[PDB]
């Protein structure tokens, strides 16, 4: 469900120069049929509107936000002769692509309407018809958008398509005038295409962008170029490499997961992995000996337990019938693999039913709204444990819920222990392999020596535990360590309330206090404590001096989502994103009691030198740094290392290695080691880098240039953060006019002043990562505090779509946004509107007082 998610990558001079020949090639089974089935199935089940509309809106908005340093502004102004190549009609009845009219109407924030658009394409209706890849007579456009299919011309393969892409790039190259820009669509990103792009186009632009809106699990891509026919030395960079890595990885994972659901509009009979199980009894009898349905319901329960099971009681064809429905999943049927006898159920809940219930119609994917945050958080949590357990491992789980999710997650040959307080409900006498339960506290004492165990867990538990006992996170952690000290375990998994970056707040979901080390969950209504990374680390170092500690990353993985799709738990993009953000402060600690230690030496902040010393090795051994399943670098090749800075030294006196680095992305990197002339891989601890502070201060002078040049002000910002501005209209973020404020360089921002700016607040927001406003959301309260002149001419525009009527010293003159408004003879309109929405013009009011009242 939900809207689409956009990804982009921009060119930066500062990165390592990657070549065309080492970007990830596309998969080779990409055309083999079952994958095609998966792509079909995912696309059919997508709650969304006109795809061509939403993609084009995304790309146009992100295209009106690319600046030329040489002239301090967008390559995308207004009035630009714009060619839409590939104008598919669209059988919706508009006969045209469904964004042109909203575009020119200026019904998009951040996208000034153009002069005109010319629609060329095979299936155009309101334009002209031609096959573009070959020459055709036309005039010159300033911006050329492309949405051309390449799975049509050229027969069914990939090299002919590769040639089509070059043809299209050259044709667009010719259509644009010097200094213009163009966007092209790519069906299949293959290596030789970027080879061609690098040796044929890159030296003929000024900047370039890559963009990927994600609406269906595919490999579609958009490539954007600026400043055509101007020479530079642009080549692919590090960010391109990383982006392509993720843009293939995500696809591969989602395709695997999607390839398991039953076909769209299928016939469930029990063999399918996911099905709507259901059984009914005609004229039910409960009170006396049944032995007929007492097994009947129990079989279904064992089939699909722990998943929501719904009932109806009604009458059909004269017979009083009871119907049971539910759903089966790999985990639900994995639980069945662990029983030996069949557990049975008390039916007392049911014979008491004296009411009447209508039946219903089976729907596999039941949810209509999108999955809630915390359920998804729990799923993304449990994927880690379900992956991190192999067969036969002797398991001790703490915080075990009464419903015992674990009995549905691990293999059916691993003994488990439930360590919790409330009595469970799971049966006792049907378990093929060992399974124990307990009624006591896992923060308590004097119960540990008697319990076997290899992997010890605690998930979404300890923060509430510490809060309940009025206990701090530090003390709670140390007491848990103490309890595990005299145990016999081997590896520990613990969810930990502790940040991973600059402390921020997630709106309405998790609000964080930096006075007392406390989180708050508003939807849950509770105040809990936390602690800090370095504080916790020493405690783990104490009881285990052989402790290798890692902080497993999640806010790029999607494999965890397989714990949803396979029991029909509908997903929303927003519910995903908030789950990553919430996870950046509720991470998971993976502690090995006898791994190889790693000590953190320097200051771990982006833009700062870091240092690590890794003991206990030999000079003939390697290390590899990964980041989002990429490869930052390896020691064997120090030079072609994708990170900004590498160092490598060895202490033949002590056998201690030394790596002294600089990074460029906040988050988690992982270092892994390679020992010997063998393919064997060891897993050393990972580490976290964090972004520089989010703090902002700004200077506002005393003289205000109410003229066109406009006042210029100082905004002190650490340069790593890139900045823009926004407005909140109707609860929705709108892009501020690039013609209104101009950043440039210290840092100085330009602004044209207006009365309208008094009645709208303005925010400086940050777009460097995938998300926006997560680190810096700084309102400009100073802007809503301006002191107008009266002896001075003024810019002026309407605030919004409401109905503001002007007053000169409390005397209405006209009415903005009114039917049958008439312009004053002393007012005057301005060439390019300063408004936040391009439709609303901007006028020139002659000197005086101007007051607007809402109505």
């Amino acid at each position: 469900v939900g809207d689409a998610l956009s990804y982009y990558v921009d060119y930066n001079r500062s990165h390592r120069v990657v070549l065309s020949s080492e970007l990830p090639q596309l998969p080779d089974t990409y055309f083999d049929g079952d994958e095609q089935y998966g792509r079909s199935l995912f696309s059919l089940a997508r709650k969304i509107g006109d795809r061509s509309l939403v993609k084009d809106t995304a790309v146009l908005k992100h295209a009106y936000q690319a600046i030329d340093p040489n002239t301090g502004k967008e390559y995308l102004r207004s009035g630009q002769s714009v060619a839409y190549f590939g104008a598919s009609a669209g059988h919706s009845g508009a006969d045209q692509p469904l964004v042109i009219e909203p575009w020119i109407q200026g019904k998009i924030s951040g996208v000034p309407p153009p002069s005109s658009v010319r629609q060329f394409g095979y299936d155009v209706a309101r334009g002209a018809i031609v096959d573009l890849a070959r020459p055709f007579p036309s005039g010159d456009y300033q911006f050329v958008y492309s949405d051309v299919d390449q799975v049509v011309d050229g027969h069914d393969d990939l090299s002919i398509s590769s040639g089509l892409v070059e043809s299209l790039l050259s044709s667009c190259m010719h259509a644009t005038a010097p200094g213009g820009s163009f966007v092209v669509k790519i069906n299949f990103p293959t290596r030789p295409v970027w080879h061609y792009i690098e040796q044929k186009i890159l030296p003929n632009i000024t900047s370039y962008m890559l963009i990927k809106p994600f609406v269906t699990n595919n490999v579609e891509l958009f490539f954007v170029a600026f400043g055509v026919h101007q020479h530079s030395s642009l080549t692919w960079t590090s960010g391109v490499y990383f982006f392509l890595v993720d843009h293939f990885y995500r696809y591969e994972t989602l395709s695997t997961i999607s390839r398991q659901l039953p076909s769209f509009g299928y016939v469930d009979d029990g063999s399918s992995v996911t099905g709507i199980e259901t059984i009914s009894i005609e004229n039910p009898g409960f009170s006396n000996m049944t032995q007929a349905a007492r097994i009947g319901i129990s079989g279904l329960c064992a089939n699909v337990g722990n998943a929501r099971k719904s009932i109806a009681i009604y009458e059909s064809h004269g017979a009083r019938v009871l119907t049971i429905t539910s759903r089966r999943s790999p985990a639900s049927a994995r639980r069945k693999s662990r029983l030996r006898y069949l557990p049975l159920i008390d039916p007392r809940s049911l014979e008491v039913q004296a009411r009447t219930i209508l039946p219903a119609d089976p729907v596999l994917f039941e949810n209509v709204s999108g999955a809630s945050p915390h359920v998804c958080l729990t799923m993304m949590y449990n994927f880690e444990v379900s992956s991190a357990v192999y067969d036969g491992d002797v398991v001790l789980d703490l915080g075990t819920g009464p419903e015992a999710k674990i009995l549905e997650l691990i293999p059916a040959t691993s003994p488990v222990t439930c360590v919790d307080i409330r009595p469970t409900a799971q049966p006792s006498g049907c378990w093929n392999v060992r399974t124990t339960f307990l009624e006591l506290d896992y923060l308590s004492d004097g119960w540990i020596t008697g319990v076997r165990g290899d992997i010890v867990t605690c998930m979404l538990s300890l923060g509430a535990a510490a809060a309940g006992k009025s206990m701090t996170f530090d003390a709670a952690f140390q007491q848990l360590i103490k309890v595990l000290s005299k145990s016999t375990a081997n590896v520990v998994l613990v969810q930990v309330n502790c940040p991973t970056d600059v402390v921020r707040s997630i709106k309405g979901y998790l609000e964080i206090d930096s006075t007392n080390k406390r989180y708050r969950f508003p939807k849950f209504g509770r105040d809990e404590p936390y602690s800090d990374m370095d504080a916790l680390e020493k405690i783990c170092r104490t009881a285990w001096p052989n402790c290798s500690i890692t902080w497993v990353p999640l806010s790029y993985d999607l494999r965890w989502t397989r714990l949803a799709l396979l029991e029909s738990t509908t997903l929303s993009s927003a519910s995903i994103r908030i789950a990553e953000l919430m996870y950046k402060y509720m991470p998971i600690m993976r502690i090995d009691i006898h791994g190889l230690p790693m000590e953190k030496r320097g200051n771990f902040i982006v833009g700062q030198n870091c240092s690590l010393v890794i003991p206990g090795f030999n000079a003939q051994d390697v290390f590899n740094c990964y980041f989002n399943s990429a490869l930052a670098f390896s020691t064997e090749d120090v030079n072609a290392a994708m990170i900004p800075q590498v160092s490598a030294q060895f202490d033949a006196t002590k056998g201690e290695w030394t790596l002294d680095m600089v990074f460029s992305d906040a988050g988690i990197y992982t270092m892994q080691a390679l020992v010997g002339s063998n393919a064997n891989p060891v897993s050393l601890g990972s580490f976290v880098v964090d972004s520089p502070d989010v703090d902002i201060t700004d200077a506002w002078p005393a003289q205000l240039d109410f003229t066109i040049a406009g006042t210029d002000v100082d905004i002190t910002v650490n340069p790593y953060y890139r900045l823009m501005t926004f407005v909140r209209i109707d609860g929705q973020w709108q892009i501020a006019n690039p013609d209104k404020f101009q950043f440039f360089s210290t840092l100085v921002m330009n602004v044209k002043l207006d009365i309208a700016d008094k009645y709208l607040l303005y925010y400086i927001r940050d777009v460097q990562s995938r998300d926006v406003g997560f680190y810096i959301q700084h309102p400009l309260q100073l802007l809503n505090t301006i002191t107008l002149p009266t002896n001075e001419d003024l810019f002026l525009s309407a605030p919004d779509m409401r109905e503001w009527a002007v007053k000169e010293s409390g005397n209405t003159i006209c009415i903005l946004n009114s039917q049958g408004f008439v312009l004053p003879q002393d007012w005057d309109v301005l060439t390019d509107t300063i408004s936040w929405s391009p439709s609303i013009p901007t006028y020139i009011v002659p000197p005086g007082d101007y007051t607007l009242t809402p109505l």
Partner: protein, 41 residues
């Protein structure tokens, strides 16, 4: 090269292909024609 789910072509980079340059198969297409105009009348 295979642009389709089912392949019934000739896998150029597939196996089973044969490269045996032989004297008997000395390549040629159309070097010259007896376009002499006396013989063309």
């Amino acid at each position: 090269g295979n642009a389709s789910s089912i392949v019934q072509t000739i896998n150029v980079t597939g196996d089973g292909n044969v490269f045996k340059p032989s004297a008997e198969t000395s390549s040629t297409a159309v070097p010259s024609l007896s376009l002499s105009p006396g013989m063309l009348n």
